[PDB]
């Protein structure tokens, strides 16, 4: 049973929180949560620093988490370890009846990234 540290799911949408907790239960590789909610200021920097594309991002409204694998051999950035987690997120999505999206040959940045879909969980107007 993988136990979670002090992780800021606080303000993350409860549908996604519950998917998180369950994916952990059923994960081959232990993981943590790097970012949950991202401030509009932090977001602004990221656009200008040429990181993120639009001024829009799931992270603003608690509709995204990014994870980091803790895979024993310490091999933190191994593509596969993120797919083992995607699989665990998808399945917790199948239970719980939540449609979860994975970033997904998958770049690190895409592979750490989970969100609740736009249709079901839309941005404020």
Numbering used by the authors: 1 to 125
How did the manuscript describe this experimental structure?
The LysECD7 is predicted to be a zinc-binding metallopeptidase with L-alanyl-D-glutamate endopeptidase activity (cd14845) cleaving the peptidoglycan (PG) stem peptide. LysECD7 reveals a wide spectrum of activity against Gram-negative bacterial species, but it is not stable enough in PBS and human blood sera. Thus, this molecule was modified with the N-terminal α-helix of SMAP cationic peptide to enhance the antimicrobial properties, suggesting SMAP-mediated permeabilizing activity of the fusion.
The active center of the enzyme contains three amino acids coordinating Zn2+ ion (H62, D69 and H117) and two additional charged acids (R41 and D114) bound to the water molecule for Zn2+ coordination, forming a charged groove important for PG binding. LysECD7 also contains the SxHxxGxAxD motif (60–69 aa) in the cleft region conserved for LAS-type enzymes. For endolysins acting against Gram-negative bacteria, the presence of an additional membrane-translocating domain is predicted, allowing the enzymes to cross the outer membrane of bacteria and reach the peptidoglycan substrate. It forms a protrusion covering the substrate binding pocket of the enzyme and is enriched in lysine residues along the inner surface. Such elements can lack a compact ordered structure, e.g., under conditions of neutral pH in vitro, while under certain conditions the structure is stabilized and the domain acquires functionality, either the IDR can fold upon binding to interaction partners such as PG and other bacterial cell membrane structures. Comparison of the solved structures of native and hybrid molecules revealed only a slight difference in two α-helices involving α2 and α5, which together with the β1-β3 sheet form peptidoglycan-binding pocket, resulting in a more closed cleft architecture of LysECD7-SMAP. We could not resolve the SMAP peptide structure, due to its high mobility, thus the LysECD7-SMAP model was used to perform molecular dynamics simulations. During the simulation the ‘core’ LysECD7 part remains stable (residues 1–131), while the structure of SMAP fragment is remarkably variable (residues 132–148), proposing the free interaction with bacterial membranes. Considering that unmodified LysECD7 lacks activity against other Gram-positive bacteria, e.g. S. aureus, we propose the substrate specificity towards A1γ-type peptidoglycan stem peptides specific for Bacillus spp. and most Gram-negative species.
